[PDB]
Structure formats: C-alpha cells, structure tokens
C-alpha cells in the first residue's frame, strides 16, 4: 500500500500561501524512501532518521509557494508576514517541513502573478487557520465602501517571479507534514 505522496510533492501547480492546499492522508503505508535534488528537510519533534518506522493516525500535507527569504518563517515560534497573516505553525508542532527551489516551474520571463500573499490583516492567524476572504482593508476612518482608494487597499499582493531574480526572491515550493496521533486506532504505519 502506497501513500499518495506522489500527488503532493510532484504536483504540477501549487496554490498560493494565502489559500494553502491541505490534503488528508490515512489508511496507507507511509514510506518516506520517496523523499530521496537540492532541498531543505527540517523535522520538528520527531527523528527524521526513522520516519519510515513510525506509526501514527493522520498525516496532513499542506502545500504552498513562498519566496526563499520566507522559508525560515515556516517554523514554530516565528514571526513575519507569512507567519502572521498567511500560515502559522503552532508552538508544539510535531511534524516536518520540506522546501525546495522551483525556479524551473514557477517562474516565467514575463513574470508570474498567479501566486498571491495576504499583506494586510487586522489580527494574527491561529495555527492552521485559512484566510480566504478578499475584502478591502480599512487603513483609515473613511469607509472603503467596496472601492480601493486612499487608506483602503486590496489585502492580497502578488509575487514577482522571474528567472533573472536572485535566489532569495526565487519561488520555493514548501510542503509541511503535520503528524497527528489519536486515541482512535491509527491507520498510517510505515
């Protein structure tokens, strides 16, 4: 039995970080031998050397695309635009983060504007909270009235992805795995 990691990691086109794609994995043998280019592999709270021999209830695969400078924000207890308003990990996070450069796929000479991130948000984000609304942000006492003028801006800002940009600004495909152990009989066992 094979867990559907092929669809997760080798997806043709990922989603923006403001609306990140969550996939639930259960009832399959989870083998991490598949995770075998130049990528970052950070595991929090678990021993990465024996993820294959570790049996637990649910796997949550969350996939999103961010810049290279924002990869370090995907970690427990980190503060930043992505962490605060787009995607936040909890303090006690039992899982792993996998990020790899994707300049070949998610960049074009004209510029890639299919990816967006939430810039303006009144409050912070609870862990694993998804903010999809696109209402105009009120930065002043005057109403936005559904119009985007002074002190009333669209909350979603597009990324600028070009092949000629530096490594820090290049698009990075990030997949974070959240492992959940439940009192109910687990059904993900490598």
């Amino acid at each position, epitope marked *: 039995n094979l867990c559907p990691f092929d669809e997760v990691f080798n997806a043709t086109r990922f989603a923006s970080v403001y609306a990140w794609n969550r996939k639930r994995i259960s009832n399959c043998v989870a083998d991490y031998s598949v995770l075998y280019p130049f990528f970052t592999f950070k595991c929090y709270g678990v021993s990465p050397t024996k993820l294959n021999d570790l049996c637990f209830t649910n796997v949550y695969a969350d996939s999103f695309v961010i810049r290279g*400078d924002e990869v370090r924000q995907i970690a427990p207890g980190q*503060t*930043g*635009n992505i962490a*605060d*308003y787009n995607y936040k990990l909890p303090d006690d996070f039992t899982g792993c983060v996998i990020a790899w450069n994707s300049n070949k796929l998610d960049s074009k000479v004209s510029g890639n504007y299919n990816y967006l991130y939430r*810039l*303006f*948000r*009144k*409050s*912070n984000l609870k862990p694993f909270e998804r903010d999809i609304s696109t209402e105009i*942000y*009120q*930065a*002043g*006492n*005057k109403p936005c009235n559904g119009v985007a003028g*002074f*002190n009333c801006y669209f909350p979603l*800002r597009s990324y*600028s992805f*070009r092949p*000629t*940009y*530096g490594v*820090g*600004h290049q698009p990075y495909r990030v997949v974070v795995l959240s492992f959940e152990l439940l009192h109910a009989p687990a059904t993900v066992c490598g």
Partner: antibody
Framework: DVHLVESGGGLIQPGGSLRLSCAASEFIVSANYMSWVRQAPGEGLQWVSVIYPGGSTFYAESVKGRFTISRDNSRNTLYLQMNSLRAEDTGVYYC???????????WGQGTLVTVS | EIVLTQSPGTLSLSPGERASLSCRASQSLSTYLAWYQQKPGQAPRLLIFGASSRASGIPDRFSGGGSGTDFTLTISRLEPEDFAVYYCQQYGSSPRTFGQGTKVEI
C-alpha cells in the same frame, strides 16, 4: 487630516530613558504598519523599528534590547520607549506609515533627540 | 543589508531640463527600490516606489526605471523646487537600508 505629529524629544543624559509619541489623524495605528526612522545630523536615513497591524515588532540590529515600539489604540498614538540611550542615538526621529513592510508613504514632522 | 551606493555625490544643473541619479546595489533587488526627496529642514517625501511607479501628488516630471542592481531616477524639467536631497531605499531584504543621499545644486 493625514498629519502625523511627533513629540517627546529633548535633551537626555546618556544612559537615560526617553519616550517618543506620534499622534495620528485619519490613520488607524492599530490597523497600519507603523515605523520609526531616525536621521543623524547631516547623515543618511536609518530605519529603527516597525510594528505590524497584528502586533509583531521588529527592530534594527543596533537598537534591539533597548528600544521598544508600542501602540495605544485608545488615543491612536504610536509610542517608542528608548532605554540606555547612547551618544550615537542623537538625531531627528520620524514616525512613518510603512505601506506593508516596503516603503514609507507618509512622514511626520520629526522631533530632535539629543544625548547630552 | 544590501549596501546602496549613489554614484554622483553632488549634481549641479541649471534650472533647465535634465537630471539623472543612479543607485547601485551590491546584490540584486528586483524592482524593490524606492526614491524619496528631502527638502532641507523638512521630512522626506516619497516619490517613486517599485522603482518605476509614481505615488500620489508627485508631478509627471519625476520618473524612474531600473531592475537588478542599477536603478535610475530622472527629472524631465528641473524646476527650482526639485533642488533638494534624494535618497534611494530598498525593501528586498531586511532591514530597509538607505543610500548616502544625492544633493542637487544650481
């Protein structure tokens, strides 16, 4: 009424503490990226600190652990508490509205802090 | 901390029609640079953001264009009000570093 007005600057003996206030009109400080930028006399600009709408705060590497940025939503004021002031902190401080964390759209008139 | 260097320390033109200010970055910024103008004894005023986009209220005489490491700010006609100090600021990385400033004279 887009004005930003700063106050609280003045002469302080080194190692002393001083609190700067930035009163804002037509700006909701709780809903905006606010920044403090200082200019030494006859020198270039140097960003000091920024506070996010959510509450996250960041400081320049030369001022962390001694400068604290804060906001009061009731009086719509931006505060900057600077403790253990050194002689290189002298200059004119500005409160600015940072569009996101990119650039400062508006600037206050600035107030002068002189360390002895 | 991308050190930002402005090639002309001072720039002395008659109040006619020409101006050019260059800002160079150590590593690439990718159109993440802004231009401010500081009149003497006054707060800085934002002119250009995104290295090519004007802000509200600044007239058509101000234009800017650049990408990567070299950025340029030009003034169509140099009206007397434009004789001040100009700064190039970056937001590609943290922190937001400024240039030394370029002062325009008559």
């Amino acid at each position: 009424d887009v004005h930003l007005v700063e106050s609280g600057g003045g002469l302080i003996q080194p190692g002393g503490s001083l609190r700067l206030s930035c009163a804002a009109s037509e700006f909701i400080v709780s809903a905006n990226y606010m920044s403090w930028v200082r200019q030494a006399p006859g020198e270039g600009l140097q960003w000091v600190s920024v506070i996010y709408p959510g509450g996250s705060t960041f400081y320049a590497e030369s001022v962390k652990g001694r400068f604290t940025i804060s906001r009061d939503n009731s009086r719509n004021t931006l505060y900057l508490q600077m403790n253990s002031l050194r002689a290189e902190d002298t200059g004119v401080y500005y409160c600015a509205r940072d569009y996101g964390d990119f650039y400062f759209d508006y600037w206050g008139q600035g107030t002068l802090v002189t360390v002895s | 901390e991308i050190v930002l260097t402005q090639s002309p320390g001072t720039l002395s033109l008659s109040p006619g029609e020409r101006a050019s200010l260059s800002c160079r970055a150590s590593q690439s910024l990718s159109t993440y640079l802004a231009w401010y103008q500081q009149k003497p004894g006054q707060a800085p005023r934002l002119l250009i953001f995104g290295a090519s986009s004007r802000a509200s209220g600044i007239p058509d005489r101000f234009s800017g264009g650049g990408s990567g490491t070299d950025f340029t700010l030009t003034i169509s006609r140099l009206e007397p009000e434009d004789f001040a100090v100009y700064y190039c600021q970056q937001y590609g990385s943290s922190p937001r570093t400024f240039g030394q400033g370029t002062k325009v004279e008559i």
